[PDB]
Amino acid sequence: GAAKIIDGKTIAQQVRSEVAQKVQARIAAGLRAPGLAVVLVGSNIYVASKRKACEEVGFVSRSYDLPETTSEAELLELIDTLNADNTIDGILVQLPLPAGIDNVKVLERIHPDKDVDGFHPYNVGRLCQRAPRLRPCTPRGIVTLLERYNIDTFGLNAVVIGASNIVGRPMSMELLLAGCTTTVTHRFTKNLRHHVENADLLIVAVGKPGFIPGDWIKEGAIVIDVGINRLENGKVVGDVVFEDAAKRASYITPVPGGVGPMTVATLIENTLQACVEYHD
Amino acid sequence: AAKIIDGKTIAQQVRSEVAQKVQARIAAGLRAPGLAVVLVGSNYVASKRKACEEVGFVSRSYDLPETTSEAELLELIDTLNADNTIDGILVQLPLPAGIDNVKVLERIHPDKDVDGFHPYNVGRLCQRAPRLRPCTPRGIVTLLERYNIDTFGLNAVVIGASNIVGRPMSMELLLAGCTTTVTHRFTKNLRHHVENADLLIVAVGKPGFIPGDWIKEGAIVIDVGINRLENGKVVGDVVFEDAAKRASYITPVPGGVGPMTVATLIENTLQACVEYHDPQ
Ligand SMILES: CO[C@H](CC(=O)O)[C@@H](C)C(=O)[C@H](C)/C=C(\C)[C@H]1OC(=O)[C@H](O)[C@H](O)/C=C/[C@H](C)CCC[C@@H]1C
Ligand SMILES: CO[C@H](CC(=O)O)[C@@H](C)C(=O)[C@H](C)/C=C(\C)[C@H]1OC(=O)[C@H](O)[C@H](O)/C=C/[C@H](C)CCC[C@@H]1C
């Protein structure tokens, strides 16, 4: 078999172009460009690479560089200022933060209307309750892929491998919203293979190179590989053995060039959504 | 033959434990927990209030005319949010047609949302960091705990994906280490899922929806249905006699999950008081 590619790099480019078109239309109408604020505390690519994508679509981005000595109170005051700044549509806080600072308290201080990452508990809870606002970036990008390839999700037996807050858990609530039967597996799952073998739609998010063998994949399955595993040679591979899974799957995301670009594109979509729906 | 999960008895023990904790607060000179219930118009309230009096809580009922505007209602929630003697706020639905349900319910501070359905609280549970939790799913977890049922590694299947039960139930189960499948109206071949379920939670509101002979031998069956029949009886979503020939444990109806829903509301109100409002 020869599974079709889910070309996330191309889809992400189409999404960014659509956003750029809407931004250019706002400017022509006399409206401001969407604005993104990134908060960096102390010091420790992805942020750089993201700003390039924001430049492409016509966003304005601003980056705060705070010293390591910054207190939790100062940081919370900054989020208050950005929350109140009408030119800011999205706030991103890069982790890790200095020790002694409560990560949760800082991230939850972001107003959910500017949480373009989609991981404020209010936004997660809204998605769970079938009334989404700003959505978790990576699971929403995956649903966008299925839509752009015209994959009917209703009644698909979907299996999510990994139950992380960043992917697995919100992924199951997106998939339920899309009408899939959803199974979430994790380290306590016994007979992982049995679940995988019955999956019409497999979302793999364990962060282990080549963890899922092609042998396990249902014939005709749709395979979404969220893994981005840095090998020592500097290159990146997914959680799925591409060459073996492509013998059985109907569609498969490569790595690189699959979910990664869609995570960035969804962050960009969320920022335009925050701008157009919540602040203008 | 299946053993009974006697939720009526468990609920009474949970209530007795709350009541004795309140006794100890009084002996130490601390205030009793307080619950406010807001009703707008006319249309289970008496039974929940009943249960609050049994455990020595303060209770407060606001009975407002159908002429109440949205602005007045929001002002009341603000007042209750700021009242240090109130640990829980319940707003009864439905509200008059002219009033925005969502804005009113989301105005409740999450640490007084003892029903557990503010999106912030649902989102916190989704993120493995629960605060006040939805009452029916949390009551079901308590049932499994009190019967010493080890949940880690169990293949759990939820029948129904309602906001009030099925969806939050999957996040409670994931937190309890279950491999969790959520099925719903678009699920293909329910029998295949039910036959593999070590733990089956049925919450569709349809008497007899799951035939008893689908139940896996030795499964734990949790019946959340409360269906009033033509002959005056109250029945669950599972035919008890048929399921009881195969299950190791089964909740009856009535007397199973229903009492635990009320007891968990009580437990949540004590929790809000002890942990979030008047800690020691
Ligand atoms: C374009 O995708 C590249 C691959 C590929 O091409 O397939 C890809 C390599 C890339 O450079 C981009 C910019 C980056 C991302 C997708 C990273 O996610 C984040 O940055 C998220 O916004 C978030 O900030 C971070 C989450 C994790 C805790 C750690 C980072 C996860 C992930 C790699
Ligand atoms: C003691 O349980 C009785 C059964 C039995 O004994 O087995 C049981 C009959 C009983 O009287 C109690 C007071 C009531 C509940 C459990 C009701 O749920 C709610 O009120 C929850 O607070 C919440 O408000 C739910 C609302 C639903 C949309 C409709 C109500 C569903 C449900 C019956």
Numbering used by the authors:
A (entry chain B): 1 to 44, 49 to 284
B (entry chain A): 2 to 44, 50 to 286
Authors' own words:
FolD is a dual function enzyme: it catalyses a reversible NADP+-dependent dehydrogenation step (5,10-methylenetetrahydrofolate (5,10-CH2-THF) dehydrogenase (DH)) and a subsequent cyclohydrolysis step (5,10-methenyltetrahydrofolate (5,10-CH=THF) cyclohydrolase (CYH)). FolD occupies a central position in the folate-dependent C1 metabolism. The secondary metabolite carolacton is a macrolide keto-carboxylic acid produced by the myxobacterium Sorangium cellulosum with an elusive molecular target.
To understand how carolacton binds to ecFolD and thus rationalize the mutations giving rise to carolacton resistance, we determined the crystal structure of ecFolD in complex with carolacton. We soaked the apo crystals of ecFolDMeth with 2 mM carolacton and harvested them after 16 h. The hydrophobic interaction between carolacton and Y50 causes a partial disruption of helix α2 (residues 45–56) and allows the Y50 hydroxyl group to form a hydrogen bond with the side-chain of R234. When carolacton is bound, the N-terminal residues of α2 and a part of the loop connecting β1 with α2 (residues 41–44) become disordered (residues 44–49). Upon substrate (or carolacton) binding, Y50 engages in hydrophobic contact that completely destabilizes residues 44–49, while the other half of the helix is stabilized (residues 50–56). K54 provides two hydrogen bonds to anchor carolacton in the active site of ecFolD and its mutation to N will severely affect the binding of carolacton to ecFolD. G8 is not in direct contact with carolacton, but its position and orientation in FolD implies that the addition of any side-chain will cause a clash with C-terminal helix α11. G261, which forms a hydrogen bond with carolacton, is part of this helix and we assume that the resulting movement of helix α11 leads to a clash with the carboxyl group of carolacton.
